[PDB]
């Protein structure tokens, strides 16, 4: 029976391949070629933010596009004011091995995680006057990679034991567990309407999941090695990914296929981050050759380089109004470009 | 103004706190601990605690002599290894009276030639000498590998072959390989592991003075 099931699986794979092939009539290289090229883009450091004692692993813009959280390897979580280069908060942690951070939409809580397989949730507004830990969520087996709030009482975690989970803060339990991968999990992004989310998982395969139901809906392939970053276009029906083979691609769900392949012949270092712009016209990226590249998302051509770092770039992000951009790298400095 | 002016104080105080933590961050000695021999690891840690007094990650903290020491002792380990680029030395423990020696050698080769470990030194422990001495008293011969001289010899011709077998496989060397045969005298282990790091830091300081 097992061999019969394998034959059925092969037939189903052939079905999927044929259905995908039946989709493409117009390639994007024959439509986006006639648009006006953006030309030259270049911007300069306005504010430089110093103070971290070691490498920088994550950052996240606020909901008002003015405050900033940052997580470093020394065990510190700093809250900055990006206008006057002021330090608003400095939070110390219990584990020194940290790999992610998040900023709650309402502005009351932050989150962190790392190699201790625990996700910690902090309260920023208290009557006594100091930042104190509110919840300590546990139950995974490997380390965490990314965490992303939805409301003030629901959080999502992904861990490199092939696992994802949805936690209800106040109760403290797992409302749903998502399984189906084979290797670790590296990155996930949430939708603007906040009903679905996507994750890439270190085996050249990416998945779209729904939270209200609980099943795994869609799968995509195409890469030759593991996946390092994933992000949503600003309408909830696209996403962009970059791998450790020094290649980036764009996926849409209804087309169920890839469209662009942003590549070059002189680049041999993999990706570490991605993020979009407001109108979906600039795709930023961080590499290991010490640069931050600026692609035009519709042509796979080149638009700019934000050079200026003395080591590898780890994280980058965009405000909620489009004015500013922020980057952070292994040299312990974090820069604001406009 | 007149209320965007206490914020400046607050920022300066936070800056002062971080600026006083920098120095203590820079004085610390971080050692990573690897091997397939759990009994040796347990014994060595117990002895280290005795000297100092005079799951996840399990960090142990010590003070050898006015210096702070941290030992970490944690299939896709290459992703895990990103966080260990600020360490000073890797301590590899191997059983000698064993076979699984080829397995240990393969693991050694996989660990050493890594891009992240271009500026870390390696300390090698070859343990369980008493069993090897007893089992060479009634000597059991080697395998088909070219043990050129004195196949059923005393330990003086087997130790050299083993240390030479491990010494190679360092394709990008740039540094020496310290080695040691573990003894039941605790102070010997403490002294050797304190000497290795001292030599490493002298080796780094003579590059700014152009040897």
């Amino acid at each position, epitope marked *: 029976e097992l061999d019969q099931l394998r034959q059925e699986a092969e037939q189903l794979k052939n079905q999927i391949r044929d259905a995908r092939k039946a989709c493409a009539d117009a390639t994007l290289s024959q439509i986006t070629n006639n648009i006006d090229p953006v030309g030259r883009i270049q911007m300069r450091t306005r504010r430089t933010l110093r103070g971290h004692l070691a490498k920088i692993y994550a950052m996240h813009w606020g909901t008002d596009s003015r405050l900033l959280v940052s997580a470093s390897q020394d065990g510190k979580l700093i809250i900055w004011d990006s206008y006057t280069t002021n330090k*608003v908060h400095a939070i110390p942690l219990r584990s020194s091995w940290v790999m992610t951070c998040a900023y709650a939409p309402s502005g009351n809580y932050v989150a962190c995680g790392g190699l201790d397989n625990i996700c910690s949730i902090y309260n920023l507004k208290t*009557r*006594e*006057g100091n930042v104190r830990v509110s919840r300590e969520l546990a139950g995974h087996t490997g380390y965490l990679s990314c965490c992303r709030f939805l409301d003030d009482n629901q959080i999502v975690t992904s861990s490199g034991d092939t696992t994802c989970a949805l936690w209800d803060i106040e109760t403290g339990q797992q409302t749903t567990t998502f399984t189906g991968h084979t290797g670790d999990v590296m990155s996930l992004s949430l939708a603007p309407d906040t009903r679905l989310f996507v994750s890439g998982a270190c085996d050249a395969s990416a998945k779209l999941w729904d939270v209200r139901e609980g099943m795994c809906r869609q799968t995509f392939t195409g890469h030759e090695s593991d996946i390092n970053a994933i992000c949503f276009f600003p309408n909830g029906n696209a996403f962009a990914t970059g791998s450790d083979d020094a290649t980036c691609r764009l996926f849409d769900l209804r087309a169920d296929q890839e469209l662009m392949t942003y590549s070059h012949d002189n680049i041999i270092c993999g990706i570490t981050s991605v993020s979009f712009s407001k109108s979906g016209r600039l795709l930023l990226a961080g590499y290991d050759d010490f640069n931050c590249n600026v692609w035009d998302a519709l042509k796979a051509d080149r638009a700019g380089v934000l050079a200026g770092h003395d080591n590898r770039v780890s994280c980058l992000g965009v405000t909620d109004d489009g004015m500013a951009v922020a980057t952070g790298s292994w040299d312990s400095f974090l820069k604001i470009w406009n | 103004s*007149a*209320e965007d002016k*206490a914020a400046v*104080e*607050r920022s300066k*105080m936070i800056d002062a706190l971080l600026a006083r933590e920098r120095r203590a961050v820079r004085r610390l000695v971080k050692i990573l601990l690897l091997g397939a021999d759990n009994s040796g690891k347990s014994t060595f840690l117990k002895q280290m605690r005795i000297i100092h007094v005079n799951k996840g990650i399990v960090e142990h903290d010590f003070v050898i002599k006015k210096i702070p020491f941290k030992m970490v002792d944690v299939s896709q380990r290459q992703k895990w290894f990103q966080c260990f680029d600020g360490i000073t030395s890797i301590l590899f423990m191997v059983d000698s009276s064993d076979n699984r020696l080829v397995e240990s050698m393969n693991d050694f080769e996989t660990i050493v030639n890594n891009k992240l470990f271009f500026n870390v030194s390696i300390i090698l422990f070859l343990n369980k000498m008493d069993l090897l001495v007893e089992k060479v008293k009634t000597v059991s011969i080697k395998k088909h590998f070219p043990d050129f001289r004195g196949d059923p010899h005393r330990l003086e011709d087997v130790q050299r072959y083993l240390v030479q077998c491990f010494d190679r496989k360092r394709r990008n060397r740039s540094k020496p390989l310290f080695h040691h045969f573990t003894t039941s005298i605790d102070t010997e282990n403490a002294r050797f592991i304190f000497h290795a790091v001292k030599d490493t830091i002298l080796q780094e300081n003579l590059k700014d003075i152009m040897l």
Partner: single-chain antibody, 230 residues
Framework: VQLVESGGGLVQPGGSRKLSCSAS????????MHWVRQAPEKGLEWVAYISSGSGTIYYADTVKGRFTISRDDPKNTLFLQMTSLRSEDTAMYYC??????????????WGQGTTLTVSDIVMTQATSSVPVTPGESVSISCRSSKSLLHSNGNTYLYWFLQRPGQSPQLLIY???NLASGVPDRFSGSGSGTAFTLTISRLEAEDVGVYYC?????????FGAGTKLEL
């Protein structure tokens, strides 16, 4: 949260006093502190300020050089030392908490103060007595003598409340925002140098006197206050 003060009493001409304040229930080392005064039947008036880290110290013009402020962190205690007091120093004194980072809400907590007895921008209060009955929507006005807006978009001004027999309580900070522990029926707005607080669906326990402060730059100045009746 608790601020408890001690030191009041009766004194002769000359003399001296040392008033103390003990804080319990919160983090003292991250806050700035103010001493504020009140005449027996008149409005409030600001006295002195000592900040976090024991750096900036500000005094008032009418007692400067006679009073002294100090703080002790490990024991969580404030002191004010007063010397050579005349007959116009009879009043009641209160201790106030504040913190200044982005988004902060100063003047949130107040103490209970002590009695002491002995043998610049200008704001104006329109009236002193306005009679109303429950269910009536009311509005109360204050005036000033300069723009309180700033090039960073702020607008510094405060409405506080004081019921019949208690200590004050923050109603509206920075002329537009609302504090914690207060109902949602309060609001307030105005143009440069002329403004009004709106109270809707008026019920009981709103009787008392209302106060309007400014905080554009030291010194800090008060008004007279409007007293309501029911």
């Amino acid at each position: 949260v608790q601020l408890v003060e001690s030191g009041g009493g009766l004194v002769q001409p000359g003399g001296s006093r040392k008033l103390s304040c003990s804080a319990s229930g919160f983090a003292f080392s991250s806050f700035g502190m103010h001493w504020v005064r009140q005449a027996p039947e008149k409005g409030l008036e600001w006295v002195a300020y000592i900040s976090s880290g024991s750096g900036t110290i500000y005094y008032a013009d009418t007692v400067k050089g006679r009073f002294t402020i100090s703080r002790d962190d490990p024991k969580n205690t404030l002191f004010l030392q007063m010397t050579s007091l005349r007959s116009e120093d009879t009043a009641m004194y209160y201790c106030v908490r504040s913190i200044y980072y982005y988004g902060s809400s100063p003047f949130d907590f107040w103490g209970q103060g002590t009695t002491l007895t002995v043998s610049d921008i200008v704001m104006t209060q329109a009236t002193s007595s306005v009679p109303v009955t429950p269910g009536e929507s009311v509005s109360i006005s204050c005036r000033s003598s300069k723009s309180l807006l700033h090039s960073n978009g702020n607008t510094y001004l405060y409405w506080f409340l004081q019921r019949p027999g208690q200590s004050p309580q923050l109603l509206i900070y920075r002329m537009s925002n609302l504090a914690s522990g207060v109902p949602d029926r309060f609001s307030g707005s105005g143009s440069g140098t002329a403004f009004t607080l709106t109270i809707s669906r008026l019920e009981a326990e709103d009787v008392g006197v209302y106060y309007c402060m400014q905080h554009l730059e030291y010194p800090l100045t008060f008004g007279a206050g409007t007293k309501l009746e029911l």
